[PDB]
């Protein structure tokens, strides 16, 4: 509707609506993931039906 | 509806609505994850039906 | 509707609506992912029916 | 000289001599490291002159 | 000289002499490293003159 | 000299002499590394004069 990100003299700013936003550092190191229907290393992530 | 992030002379600011936002540092190191239907290392994450 | 990212003298800024945005550093290193219907290393990610 | 790792029916075993060995899980997440000549996140590590 | 790794019915075993061995999971996520002559994220690591 | 890795019914085993061996999972995600003569993300690593 009326979402807003208002400022001045900033560095970073985000306004997501209903999705996914990834803007940072990340590191994953699996070694073994078993089973079916398994999410292993998901960072920014939405999911429905 | 009327969500808002209002300031001045800032550094970081976020306004999520209904999703996922990741803006920080992260590190995961699994070694073994068993079973089915298992989420292993999820950082920003929503989930439904 | 009326989404907005308003500032001045900034460095980075994002306004997603309903999708996915990836603007950061990421590193994944799996070794073995088993099972069917498994998401292994998804960074910015939406999903429906 | 006469270093030795002797056993039976074991799982893990290591015999380092004078170096570095890393065989475990680790996770580091800095955010800001300042200064010169600084070691930030070192896991297995020797150092001389 | 007479270094040795002796066993039976094992899983993992290492015999380094004077170097570096990395056999484990690791994850590093810096964001900002300053200064000159700085080691940031070193896992298995020897160093001389 | 007389270095040795002796076992039976094993899974992994290493015998380095004087160098570097990397046999594991790793993930690094820098964002900014400053300065001169800086090692940023070194995993298996020896170094002299």
Author numbering:
A (entry chain B), B (entry chain C), C (entry chain A), D (entry chain F), E (entry chain E), F (entry chain D): 50 to 98
What does the paper say about this structure?
In this work, we determined the cryo-EM structure of G51D fibril strain prepared in vitro at a resolution of 2.96 Å. The G51D fibril is composed of two intertwining protofilaments with a right-handed helix. The subunits within each protofilament stack along the fibril axis with a helical twist of 1.26° and helical rise of 4.86 Å. Residues 50–98 of α-syn form the fibril core (FC), and the rest of the residues in the N- and C-terminal regions are relatively flexible in the fibril and invisible by cryo-EM imaging. The G51D FC consists of six β-strands (β1–β6) which arranges into an extended serpentine fold. In the WT1a structure, G51 is involved in the steric-zipper interface of the two protofilaments formed by residues 50–57 (50HGVATVAE57), which is assumed to be disrupted by G51D mutation. Instead, this segment with G51D mutation flips 180° perpendicular to the fibril axis and forms a β-hairpin structure with residues 60–66 in the mutant fibril. Meanwhile, V74, A76, and A78 that used to be buried inside the WT1a FC are exposed in G51D FC and form a homotypical steric-zipper interface to bundle the two protofilaments together. Thus, the replacement of Gly to Asp disrupts the β-turn formation and leaves the entire N-terminal (residues 1–49) flexible and invisible from cryo-EM.
